[PDB]
Design a protein around this ligand. Structure first.
Ligand SMILES: Nc1ncnc2c1ncn2[C@@H]1O[C@H](COP(=O)(O)OP(=O)(O)OP(=O)(O)O)[C@@H](O)[C@H]1O
Ligand SMILES: [Mn+2]
Ligand SMILES: [Mn+2]
Length: 295
């Protein structure tokens, strides 16, 4: 089990994605090999799991709480954090991560807060959701415009492909605000973009409210909500991965799912050390009165 963080994998050969002949064992080995990359995000944050017992061809189970986990190493959080439900979950090691895969996990989504203080978010996320028939160039243009607004506000933003059809923007924040304040700030940004360019942006959820447009989703900033982790796999055809990218290579991207679990190694080799999110951990910023004025 040297390639699976010491974890025994049952039914190693069952297929997670038949389209590319990716097995459960391959998926486990991927998480063992890149455990450190995924932990850059999961290590100190509660995590929600997307489990697919029968592969992407079957149905998915989105789990937030668990009464009796069977993942050696998985941490069960205090119920007081979410009364009326079993304990939340946290993965802090490669063993726990691979153990989750052994139990059917395919995707890992994390909270916008860390164990240091789960009542004060340390980031907010903007998820650009396009019309299922909108040209890719529209997403690129929308992402560029969103980054421009963030720069005017004075906030550093870190982007990554979602692995699906859109782009994710993560904005770190000092733990000085409560959940409602951060969510309202994110909503303010969405609404602002929707007012400036109503032909491109929408601040209202629902596909019927973004026909031929892009929805700047701010709803994942609610307490308990989560966003797919950087470098994590998506339970979709080809097993694409959510990949952090430089703003400079934004216009060179062709799709939100251009990288997958098997092409990630090549991506990392091409970068050869270059880290798109190198300045993430060192970023120190907070919601200011000036920011609110601009919105
Ligand atoms: N079955 C579910 N029930 C409730 N919430 C879910 C469920 N599945 C996923 N979610 C949450 O809602 C969000 C939506 O995931 P989704 O893949 O649809 O958006 P995405 O990560 O941006 O990919 P895309 O670019 O295709 O929109 C996730 O971040 C997840 O936390
Ligand atoms: Mn989305
Ligand atoms: Mn969304």
């Amino acid at each position: 089990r040297a390639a699976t963080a010491g974890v025994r994998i049952s039914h190693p050969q069952r297929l997670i994605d038949p389209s590319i002949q990716a097995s459960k064992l391959e998926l486990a080995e991927f998480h063992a090999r890149y455990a450190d990359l995924l932990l850059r995000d999961l290590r100190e944050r509660p995590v929600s799991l997307v489990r697919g017992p029968d592969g992407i061809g079957g149905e998915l189970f989105f789990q937030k709480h668990a009464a009796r986990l069977k993942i050696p190493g998985i941490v069960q959080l205090d119920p007081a954090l979410d009364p009326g439900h079993p304990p939340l979950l946290q993965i802090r090691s490669a063993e726990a991560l691979v153990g989750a895969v052994q139990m059917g996990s395919i995707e890992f989504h994390t909270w916008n807060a860390s164990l240091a203080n789960l009542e004060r978010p340390d980031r907010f996320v903007l998820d650009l959701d396009p019309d299922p028939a909108l040209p890719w160039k529209r997403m690129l243009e929308a992402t560029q415009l969103s980054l421009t607004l963030l720069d005017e506000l004075g906030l550093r933003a870190f982007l990554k492909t979602s692995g699906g059809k859109g782009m994710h923007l993560l904005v770190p924040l000092e733990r000085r605000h409560g959940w409602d304040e951060v969510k309202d700030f994110a909503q303010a940004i969405s609404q602002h973009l929707a007012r400036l360019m109503p032909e491109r942006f929408s601040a209202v959820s629902g596909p019927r409210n973004r026909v031929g447009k892009i929805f700047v989703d701010y709803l994942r900033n609610s307490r308990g909500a989560s966003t797919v982790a950087a470098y994590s796999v998506r339970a979709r055809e080809g097993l694409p991965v959510s990949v952090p990218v430089f703003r400079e290579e934004l216009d060179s991207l062709q799709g939100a799912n251009q990288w997958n679990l098997r092409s990630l190694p090549q991506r990392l080799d091409e970068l050869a050390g270059d880290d798109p999110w190198a300045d993430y951990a060192g970023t120190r910023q907070r919601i200011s009165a000036a920011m609110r004025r601009q919105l």
